[PDB]
Amino acid sequence: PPPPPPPPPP
Amino acid sequence: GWNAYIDNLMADGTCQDAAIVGYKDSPSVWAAVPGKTFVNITPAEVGVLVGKDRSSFYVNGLTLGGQKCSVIRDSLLQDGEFSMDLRTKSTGGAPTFNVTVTKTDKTLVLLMGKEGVHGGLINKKCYEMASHLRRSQY
Amino acid sequence: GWNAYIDNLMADGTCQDAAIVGYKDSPSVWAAVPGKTFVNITPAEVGVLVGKDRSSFYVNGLTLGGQKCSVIRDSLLQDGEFSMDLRTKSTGGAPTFNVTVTKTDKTLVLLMGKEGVHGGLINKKCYEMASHLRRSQY
Numbered sequence: 057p058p059p060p061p062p063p064p065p066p
Numbered sequence: 067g068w069n070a071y072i073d074n075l076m077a078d079g080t081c082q083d084a085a086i087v088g089y090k091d092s093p094s095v096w097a098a099v100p101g102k103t104f105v106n107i108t109p110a111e112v113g114v115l116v117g118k119d120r121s122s123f124y125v126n127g128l129t130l131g132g133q134k135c136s137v138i139r140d141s142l143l144q145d146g147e148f149s150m151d152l153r154t155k156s157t158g159g160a161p162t163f164n165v166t167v168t169k170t171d172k173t174l175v176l177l178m179g180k181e182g183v184h185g186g187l188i189n190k191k192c193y194e195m196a197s198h199l200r201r202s203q204y
Numbered sequence: 205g206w207n208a209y210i211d212n213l214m215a216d217g218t219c220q221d222a223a224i225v226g227y228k229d230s231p232s233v234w235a236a237v238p239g240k241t242f243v244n245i246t247p248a249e250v251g252v253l254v255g256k257d258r259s260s261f262y263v264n265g266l267t268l269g270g271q272k273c274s275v276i277r278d279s280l281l282q283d284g285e286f287s288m289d290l291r292t293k294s295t296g297g298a299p300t301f302n303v304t305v306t307k308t309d310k311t312l313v314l315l316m317g318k319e320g321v322h323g324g325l326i327n328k329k330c331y332e333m334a335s336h337l338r339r340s341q342y
Binding site for chain 3: 061062063064065066
Binding site: 059 | 204
């Protein structure tokens with residue numbers, strides 16, 4: 057159960 | 067990034083497609099299995115999913131990535147059970163699969179199981195991922 | 205929106221500064237922490253970081269927004285690695301902080317840890333942010 061990823065670019 | 071979630075969902079080999087879609091602002095596919103169906107979901111299809119018409123798609127199902135689906139149980143906007151269960155419309159062809167769409171604060175987690183895979187198993191997998199997402203502010 | 209990457213990077217409290225710098229064509233800060241150091245990085249400094257000539261690093265370090273740093277390891281331009289570990293230089297018994305700079309296709313990601321945070325932790329956060337970007341063709 058990984059941590060939430062960055063949002064998509066721009 | 068989001069690629070790890072798709073790999074995670076598909077890891078047990080029981081599913082054939084998966085996707086995480088942002089529905090707030092401008093619906094976009096954040097990560098989906100390549101060369102499949104969910105990768106082609108459109109903003110219009112997403113609009114239907116989070117829409118106000120919760121019974122119209124009961125006689126006439128809906129489409130995800132072009133694929134026509136039959137809503138067998140709708141609880142997407144319901145407090146707690148934020149999920150929806152569907153089947154792949156075998157209007158033609160032959161194989162029908164179970165799909166589950168779960169909703170979080172910013173995303174829609176979609177899962178499609180392989181032929182024969184018990185629906186509830188797809189629901190469990192899809193529902194637990196979203197539960198992890200919402201507790202993580204997503 | 206690039207400021208969301210800044211928020212995301214700053215969330216756990218391990219970092220005191222962060223920035224996403226565009227180095228291609230005309231270099232500029234796409235997003236940084238207001239009131240801090242990285243926000244003041246100059247195009248000259250960005251040019252130093254991406255030039256093929258690494259002579260000065262081993263001469264007496266380099267500056268980031270005026271802040272002088274010592275180069276612990278430079279693999280920034282090296283494929284498959286694309287990272288550079290630094291350390292701020294201080295006067296007096298003022299603390300020194302770990303700084304990591306990773307590069308992508310169009311971006312430079314900068315992170316300054318707080319006093320006491322290990323460089324290895326700073327390197328992972330940065331590298332993970334850089335891998336996500338390069339996957340999105342950034």
